Amino acid sequence: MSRGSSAGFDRHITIFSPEGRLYQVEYAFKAINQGGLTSVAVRGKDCAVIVTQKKVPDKLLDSSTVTHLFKITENIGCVMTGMTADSRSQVQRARYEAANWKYKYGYEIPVDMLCKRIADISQVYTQNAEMRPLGCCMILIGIDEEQGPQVYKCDPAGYYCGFKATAAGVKQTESTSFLEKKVKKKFDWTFEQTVETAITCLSTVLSIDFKPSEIEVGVVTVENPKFRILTEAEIDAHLVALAER
Template sequence: MSDYTDRYITVFSPEGRLFQVEYASKAITGSNTYVNSIGIRSKDYAIVIAYKRLPEKLVDPISITHIFQISPSIGCVMAGSVPDARALVTRARSEAAEFHKTNGYEIPCNALSQRLANINQVYTQRAHMRPLGVAMTLISVDDEFGPRIFKVNPAAECIEYNAVASGPKEHQLLTYLERKLGDRRYAFGNWRRLANMGVKALNAALATTLESDEVEVGVVGINGFRKLTLREVKNVLRDVKWDILIERESRPCVV
């Protein structure tokens, strides 16, 4: 019988694992999670997309969001536990505001991401705390490096990506994005083309047609971060449906 001390947050198992951190990751990729998220960047833009599955039919979709603005130039998408997401977003906004007050300019996305990863690391070594069961994907446009995407997870890893996904369908989404990122149309396209690819990835991974109240999109460019309106999301979904229809009709008929 295994020693229950292996399950403590401050004790490594004989295999060198922290089970509570792994359980927190399961809160992001488990089947009971209601959101899949994507982050993609091109030469000039970065976007985040969230697919939210409503827990109950009577829930108003507008009352549930997984995309947040941290500062005028930084936005994020959260996947995992909704209460933990709200707590980490609040902490991120506080850190960004404190940095701006102290230094007189906005916090860079890489500095904020590393700061949040450091906070998550503290949660893995204190007995009176537990890791936050949420993955945070931050996007911004840097004056020197251009669009940037960072992902912070419960294990306190902070990694920069060209494209990233989180949620129960993470593997399928990453497989789709890996195939498409070699297309130069997306590397130099506008944010609409990125949103088109992201929605197609969700369509392929979920094997369903997405509705406008199930999708959220946030985009960041040189003018800062903003969340798309419902009308703009409907236009993106309409374009995707037309593209899928055209692709089906252009396929050769096999006899």
């Protein structure tokens, strides 16, 4: 780094710990937790759904601008958890990479490749001294031509694995446990079923019943591969359906 490498093992990204752990990556994960929100993504056999809690702090704040659901391309959308600025930067980088892939290869980038590129950039961040890992987490969704719905979460360390039900944020562990319980019980996993699973998982881990304005839901289905943001009325309808049954 231009300023200079730090002294302590946990004070710099590059130098290792006696075990060999990199404490700066773990602190980036702690920053992701510091984001303050929780995001849940569920993969079905017909659609992929991402649900995250929307918290407009002040009335003066315009709720329209407050959103963590961003679209990378017309068919791929993402939900970001962690620092807002870092998440925006990663979203811009993913958009640029997807556009470049489309330009160079003649077909839309798969979700797995998008996260692979993002994770490679993250690894580059964690290896050099000048830069620092981004304190945010990326969860990408999209319908593949042959593999169907795909959900991938994409972390500061550089891990780009894919999941049947992804969770990220403050309540990542509890959401993961709930989603594992639900997955162990294999339902039909229809569109509305996946939406209900995500919403009820988030409500259970947050111990609160959401109104239409407290969450934002983005969906992408096989029939409609375009990334779609659920309108507040549709979220309210889903919540009413959950309440009834």
